[PDB]
Every structure is written in structure tokens, then in C-alpha cells.
Copies of this chain bind each other. A is one copy, B any other.
């Protein structure tokens, strides 16, 4: 319906390939979206750490408010979009979000101009688009 996977033999295997890449990519973007929803406290945490290694540790060792991404994060489809290698201790627990080391690493590598209105929105648009692609891919394979 959206033509997400190029025609040309082994469509099902190639569809599964796109699905698993999309989940990995959506996982990172989800971390960034969450960080961008909490940017003051995220930045305070980093300023308050002596090293990037200690900041990464701080980022993952406490829960984050869902903020402006709560509605997306709590959707049943968004849970279904999580990578299946992801342990149950990560994502949403008791109203708060728990980051992985990989998502914390990407947050630390954000550049300051990502905080501008248009760049923040492009991260959210890209995350939503990925969620939509994943839901579509999964549905194709649900038969």
C-alpha cells in the first residue's frame, strides 16, 4: 500500500529485513525524542557528570518523564515496534521511561542545533514515520 519494499524475489525475507532494520532505527530515534522531551533535565544531568562515561551511566540509571512523547510511547503499536532483543527492564516502567546504553550514547552525541524548533520536529517526524512503516510492515507479515 505504501510500497516499502522493492519488488524482486524473496519478498517475505526482504520484508522481514526492512522490519528489523526499522525497529533498530526507531529504537534510537525513540531515545532522542524522549531526551528532546526532557531537554533541560537531560542537559543538567550531563553538565553534572565529570565524564561522558559517567553521564551515560546517569542517563540509564533513572526513569524519565514521558513528556510530549507520552501518547506515542504508550500506544500498543509502539510496544509492538520495540526490538525483540530488548529486555523487559527497558522502555516504560511505572509511568517513566528507562533508556538503554545505546540510546544514551546517541543522546550524548546530539549536537546543540538539534535543540532548535525545526530540528527537534524533524526528529519527531522521522520517529512517527518509522512507527507507521513498522505497523505497515508487520501487518503485511501477519497472514
Contact-residue bracket for chain A: 20 to 34
Residues of A89-132 at the interface with B, using a CB-CB cut-off of 8 Å, are 107-113, 115-119
Evaluate contact between A111 and B113: CB separation under 8 angstroms. no
Indicate if A49 sits at the interface (CB-CB under 8 A).
yes
Q: Least Cβ distance of A77 to chain B in Å? A: 29
Question: Within the oligomer, what is the number of copies of this chain?
Answer: 2
Evaluate contact between B43 and A116: CB separation under 8 angstroms. no
Evaluate contact between A108 and B111: CB separation under 8 angstroms. yes
How far is A32 from B115 in the complex, measured between Cα atoms in Å? 17
Q: Least Cβ distance of A105 to chain B in Å? A: 9
Residue on B nearest A49 in the bound complex, by CB: B116
Indicate if A26 sits at the interface (CB-CB under 8 A).
no
How far is A51 from B17 in the complex, measured between Cα atoms in Å? 34
Residues of A53-86 at the interface with B, using a CB-CB cut-off of 8 Å, are 54-55
Name the residue among A47, A50, A107, A112 with the largest chain B CB count within 10 angstroms: A112
> Assuming the A-B contacts A49-B117, A51-B116, A116-B49, are A109 and B111 also in contact, with contact meaning beta carbons closer than 8 angstroms in the complex?
yes
Q: Least Cβ distance of A33 to chain B in Å? A: 15
> Assuming the A-B contacts A110-B112, A111-B109, A112-B112, are A117 and B43 also in contact, with contact meaning beta carbons closer than 8 angstroms in the complex?
no
Name the residue among A40, A110, A115 with the largest chain B CB count within 10 angstroms: A115
5 A/B residue pairs, CB under 8 Å, sorted by A: A47-B115, A48-B117, A50-B117, A110-B111, A111-B111
